[PDB]
């Protein structure tokens, strides 16, 4: 038996071992062909038609490259063909649990539709994996290639979700600790999933990627850090790591949190809410699930994809009128309208428990201005976006180990002051976007007065356009002028 | 009134006129987001997730580039804003008629489901364009921006499908003849649709593009050729024009006619045929249409997209069983198996009316070999692919006009023997691929012996691997050495 | 007369007006073919073989794109073909005054050869432009295309060096003020020269570019600011402008100030100092000049290119032995050895008058360790590098104007707090690199100890590898751990 | 420890320290001062790249191909030692290039030294010898497990072929396939091409059609006529025809560009007029000329693109003629392109005839009234042989393939098994004519002689023939 070759525009010709092919050629993996990587970003960036499927191949490919690289350079690590496959499998499978429109589903749909449940795509990836394995006769095929399903299935799932329950992992011991850093690096977020999506999202969005993962791979080594074996970067490359998270943040600003992309994701989510009662997805034993409950049964979830959008769009059932009308207004580009953007100030930190209350606050504002129409809470959306370097307030580069040229086996720490003064002083912040559902000229004018008035009242930053959109309101606030 | 900017990975930041934006923001154009450009090719090239929507924006942009370039260099042509917009609209809309999986629908499915009808995506584009214009109050918007609907609608349709019936066109006179060479060039095939898909398909497939469309635009001029003002290429660019069609042929060979890609298209088509009695598509006044009759009402056709594939795959209806199973086999990768490729020799052409007879002819071969199983006509698929330079046996470069540096207004002609001896002798050929529906080790062995024997019997070329797949058959034929 | 097309790998097919062709085809322009853009950088990045010539074509191209784009969108500015040509010429001739190995020459060599005189490549470009025009008969050709020599030459020089002495410019009035911001923007540094070197350097270096100059041009508008017409960016592009300076700093970190690149430049400069007396360059009327004095006569400077490197390398005269040995060490790669890098803490900064004393300070450190050799001051090279966003301590985005979508003719200001808390808190810093001229294991061992001890004594930052290269030294300083 | 180098084409390349010692010599570093495409840079301003970085990439790619063969097929017994000798050959096959690359051994040496037979390959072998001996590389080689007696011979043989029956001494015939990596004499499918396709394209602003990585992935070693050879996958045969189509296309667009070539020619004339006056020092202190530097490697080491500027900046009265030609280049006062034509039917122009062609053009008698009469010396006639690397032969007839169902069995694939759309011929000649007199009247005359001459010889009708010579082309019925 020989390898399958697959051509990918990002990575070129990738070789896939027959076990990986077996996993890929299943309904549970192929499902990822019908889930757009960037959700509603396709409706803003017309090149972003790419799906989770090809992203997963790439992650699997890169996990293999990193593990081979480490193995060829340091044979004393005892990296086995078995470890390589298990890392490739984890990389292939870490995106299995995504739902329709990727981050729209667990980021917006599930939290509103079922506020009580605790669901992430990572948890889904682990459940969908198990389902893939059992439904498809994968265990014997693993054994055929030297894998041991008892330990290795555990290893794979641990790589995706972390500790399943003082070394906390059963899949592998502390001397393979570095394997846990490849696919999903819980310590600092420097992993191959980022490296595929940087290169791949840039290719499709029409933005260029400034981070060189192949250079990182050539400089990476394993060293003993606090009695674990860990992946270490070369000292003088610390600048590139900082830039890696800078790039992540700027891809979030330019594309992933695009103000129209997010409002499209919001309109899609609203339509899913209105359709949730009347759509049925046949699960295991012929049982019936909703869009919001297909997450409890992997056989139903298997069939939950972006197709839901077009089920609703093309439906004739009058119970779906409301859902269908909202999708129709997306097609006509009759979208909820962007009013503006602001941030908090000092150490105001807007908590999740207060998200529901923000539209009422905006409608409660009392601008000293004569207004033709008057707007209510229902007429406002307030979207709160938590921008960070992947570790809330923490600097992930403080959780990175390095080595120097003169003694490559010796791990060292590097602080922000040892690198540059031109680096960020904070590593997290919030943006607040405000939109109005009432879109004629007179409503939009009013929305802008209320909005800027509210920014004034809450001591938020002056919107960039504030003097233009609300010249009677911005003189009131001393901090602004 | 301002231009929308859109960012395209192929062309960068494209500007859209408000009238173009009102056309794009309709159900009839937006449906092109759910039709893959390369149909089944996504299932072989994982980067080829792109859809018809982004290709159409590009054709529209490049149509505008070529018409602006001509207008700037040659003001005497009297090219107006109005002409520019109609060329852009024809370019944006020339792909409106595509069905599910693009060329699969009009090249595999409709010929087999509706043999009696003359259907092309071109004729669909015109029907869909009229439906788009009437359904969305576009005629007053055209008038708002200085177009004259009865004249300009005719012009737009003529650019897409040719004369609607001296000078055969009603929309513009012969002094504007060159404008009909931009979006769909019936004389020699050199047009902006090709240029967009060379660049876009190559970006997504992972095969680099070798044709430079920007260089062609820099050198393009309008000259008088037999009493019409036509587009002329610079003399010493003739070589790049030959390379253009060489590139087109190369992409057909590597990607568009990939042997697995074509058989996935075949399987899907099969699923669609078995499903066609049962799928209802709701059209005008709530009447119901079939997949095969959606082409008869544009309201229904508006809703006929790649969605149909997943409607079938996720159906529970027992009546859709056989269709659903074929699509499920695609997911497991249990595909009909490729047996080999051959071509006709000498004078033999194979006409479209002989296609049905071929699986029978393969089944009737009598290979002199020990064969465990016996295969019937219904076990074989025979795909006949007509490969050419866009004009059957004709050299399209014989239908291009050139100018020289010393007399830029004087059109000339250039023959093949004035360019190079390293150019093709013929400009059309046929490939014949044979596949087997039974996929076991023994049926496949038999399939190979029938196929190679059939090749020998019909005097076709020796398959490349023929001495390996049937070592006992290929000795018999002296022509094969 | 028609346009020359040139194919550039960065911009594609650029059209050049016949006047521009005439300026280009002179010894004074063609000179730039023999001057490497990145100096000694090619000896580290083997892709960086590019010369100032192609970069100059690119700057002129982009200068025309920006002026044409402003003209098309805003006809009310009265941009004439005259203005376009002059801006293009200023763009082409901006780099005429570079010397051998570009920034090496005016950044290292001239300051050490002729400490008293003050020479910049900007003034060199103005003096070389004049000599180009005068020696080649360009004035009459200017007039043949409707330029007015006395106004327009003044305008061209002014766009390069700024005012030649309260509206300070003679070449154009205040109502064309925006034209002074295209080629060399003295207010904030946002200009087309950067845009060309970002794309070009990246293409050659093998590092990818994050900045989209074409997006910036699409969003640019001229608006009234303090009673001046200025170029304004769209408000919500403010983040991209910050990203632009971030990309510049990043290229300086990775490439332009590479530690080995800089030392090669330093070694080359040392060879030129040793050669300076003996190399003769013939200027106006057979007067003889040195490498250091060819900047006084433009006929000599025309003949001063990277060729100097090879004339020294290939020489056999005993007078040049010392120069020739240093260049031979470059070939053998027996370079001065990098010791390490630190930065100053607090807001101490090292003034340019202290730079000479710094090698003596390093030799005067007394690390408490067995050293087999003592090093003297002349064994050390100390390279101090100012990193900023182009305006020393200042935020150049404070000197940029913006407009918003609701009133596109109203200029506004945006402050750093209106953008992001993730931005740099400072805009300038110093790097200090230390190298040793004695390269054997013992001397380098000692240099590391002198070095780290000198960092400790001065309260500079702990070198990243300090614990590894000087473990007997770093324990003394409590703050380091 | 490896050194890492960032190349824009290939990315981060790892160099074994033995490679680094070869590279860090005067003999290898001189390749920094020799442009890959010669006078091409004077037409394509992106093509500033030199032979140095091309050499690195051929070295990297030779390494990639041998490694990949070793990993896929351990039964070939490819050792670390074999990998290093193949990387060195790859690295060193360009060492013998002279100023402006193909200008030097294509134009200047054949005119200045017609007596001698000289190629850049021979020069790469002589330069490699000098590199080794001048820099103490033999003991460094021993230190990494190489054996200089055998391994120097193997490296040389990889560049130049056999140095006089299995013809090779550097390796036995079980390692036959290793001779097919750096410079493949059987069919021209080697890594030198792959690097230049990608590199030249990147700098020229033309996009490359060929996927070398895909080729490496599908490559295998099989036995073919009692010899191990690199074989390709059967279905990749179309890609191989494409590779040669790409090569020809790059020749047409860039390497034989009508002005690039005429700049090479002018530079070549400059070097001919300077040859008596430039002196370059060699071993034992002996002086050599531009034309005789090839006889002494210590002198040849100092002979690079710098000679062009030494001539351009010179003050010596004796160099004035050579200096003026180079100054004509700066001012863009070039010899003028007149046109292009080809022979017809079986006609083939012989290399002994090239000299006489300008006499033929000047001796033509166009029926047109002319102000100027032009002599033989006013014309340059450039004959360019365009092929698929093997004169009239199809290189894909010399490639071995394997199919999926029997990967160890070599097969042959004929052109009719592939496509009817492929070339029927694999070689042709282009004839370009230029005039050294550049005034409008001379150029108009040059055009009438040229088209008359094409008509006399029954060559192809130039493409612009009815426009440039409307009074000459109606005489020829074959043309209309
Ligand atoms: N010339 C060419 N053909 C295919 N191709 C892409 C498609 C796919 O991503 C990858 C492997 O395709 P290939 O056709 O080699 O594989 P297949 O499985 O059909 O053939 P087999 O080896 O089983 O006969 O490359 C590609 O980029 N270029
Ligand atoms: N930083 C960045 N933003 C957007 N963008 C892409 C997306 C889209 O194809 C094109 C225009 O987006 P923009 O955000 O400018 O338009 P929008 O309509 O949302 O803003 P408006 O002008 O209405 O306020 O650019 C892009 O590539 N990079
Ligand atoms: N096929 C091809 N040829 C040239 N070329 C590049 C080189 C050069 O930068 C630009 C213009 O070259 P061209 O050959 O068109 O100009 P030339 O001046 O020799 O021809 P003329 O028009 O005077 O006859 O394009 C290019 O990319 N591809
Ligand atoms: N950030 C960055 N730096 C360098 N670089 C390029 C230059 C060069 O071709 C290759 C290796 O450079 P590096 O700086 O890593 O090596 P050097 O020999 O100086 O460091 P050492 O390891 O000896 O300390 O990469 C690169 O692309 N990006
Ligand atoms: Mg296959
Ligand atoms: Mg908008
Ligand atoms: Mg020309
Ligand atoms: Mg180093």
Numbering used by the authors:
A (entry chain B), B (entry chain C), C (entry chain D): 113 to 277, 284 to 599
D (entry chain A): 114 to 277, 284 to 599
Pull text from the paper.
The sterile alpha motif and histidine-aspartate domain-containing protein 1 (SAMHD1) is a 2′-deoxynucleoside-5′-triphospohate (dNTP) triphosphohydrolase that cleaves physiological dNTPs (but not ribose-based NTPs) into 2′-deoxynucleosides and inorganic triphosphate. The triphosphohydrolase activity of SAMHD1 requires the assembly of a homotetramer complex, which is regulated by the binding of GTP or dGTP to the allosteric site 1 (A1) and any canonical dNTP to the allosteric site 2 (A2)17,18. Recently, SAMHD1 was found to hydrolyze cytarabine triphosphate (Ara-CTP) and several other nucleoside analog triphosphates used for the treatment of leukemia. We show that DAC-TP is both an activator and a substrate of SAMHD1.
DAC-TP and AZA-TP both contain the same modified nucleobase that closely resembles cytosine, except for the carbon at position 5 of the base that is replaced with a nitrogen atom. The only difference between these two nucleotide analogs is that DAC-TP contains a 2′-deoxyribose sugar, while AZA-TP possesses a ribose sugar with a 2′-hydroxyl group. However, when GTP was added to the mixture, DAC-TP (but not AZA-TP) was hydrolyzed by SAMHD1 just as efficiently as canonical dCTP. Size-exclusion chromatography revealed that DAC-TP, but not AZA-TP, induced the formation of higher-order SAMHD1 oligomers. To elucidate how DAC-TP binds the catalytic pocket and A2 site of SAMHD1, DAC-TP was co-crystallized with the inactivated catalytic domain of SAMHD1 (residues 113–626 with H206R and D207N mutations), which has been extensively used to study nucleotide binding to SAMHD117,18. The crystal structure of the complex, determined at a 2 Å resolution, demonstrated that DAC-TP molecules can occupy both the A2 pockets and catalytic sites of the SAMHD1 tetramer. The hydrogen-bonding interactions between the SAMHD1 catalytic pocket and DAC-TP are the same as those involved in dCTP binding. Although an additional water molecule forms a hydrogen bond with the position five nitrogen moiety that is only present in the base of DAC-TP, this extra water molecule, interestingly, did not engage in any interaction with SAMHD1. Moreover, SAMHD1’s catalytic pocket was not altered by the interaction with DAC-TP, suggesting that DAC-TP adopts a binding mode similar to that of canonical dCTP (lower inset). In accordance, our current results show that the 2′-deoxyribose nucleotide DAC-TP (but not the ribose nucleotide AZA-TP) binds to both the allosteric A2 and the catalytic site of SAMHD1, being both a substrate and an activator of the enzyme.
